[PDB]
Design a protein around this ligand. Sequence first.
Ligand code: NA
Lengths: 120, 120
Amino acid sequence: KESRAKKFQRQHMDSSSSTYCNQMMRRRNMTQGRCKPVNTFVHEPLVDVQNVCFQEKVTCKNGQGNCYKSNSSMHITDCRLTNGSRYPNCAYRTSPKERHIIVACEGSPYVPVHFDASVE
Amino acid sequence: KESRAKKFQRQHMDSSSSTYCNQMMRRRNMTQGRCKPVNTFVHEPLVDVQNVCFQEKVTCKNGQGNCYKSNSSMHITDCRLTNGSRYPNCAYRTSPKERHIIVACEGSPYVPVHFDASVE
Ligand code: NA
């Protein structure tokens, strides 16, 4: 009753991750008052990301503040607003990647406070 | 009232991926009667995976049938059962990766029917 092809779908396909940005940009309030054009989410334990503040210091994109690059590449997702989107209708392409992340850190305790960029 | 650090958490952290395999292995029935020890899920449009049947032919892992390797590397997730797990409680480590996928295809229409392996 279950075809080989359907069973391959059931066992190895999950294209639904495509829905992730639309869901999360909204849930996390980056579509209040404006559609945030780009955003990156990091899928790692908080602690691991926090530790980056004590890894390789580098120059922030704009030359301002103190930035740090992850020793390891990390799982992230880039969300990009579609060209067609107009507030209050915010749709996003979801792009999973493995990349080193660059964060800006400050304060006491010294912790991440901006996502600067990612890198191959 | 929202600290810069909390805002970074809200805008760029999502550590919840670590439970993906536990959820999906269950939802897709690979924890009925047994804990399936390993499994891979592909996060790409179905169509893009189907098109692999028309990309580079290669030898299947066990030398049997017709297998094909993706031109591009694709977003996937490997699930590995933990050594401690015992049916009916199946816990999995979730490992996102970018890899070329190798599928076996057959039939008319010619479509994927087994996940053979992945490759760097
Ligand atoms: Na699809």
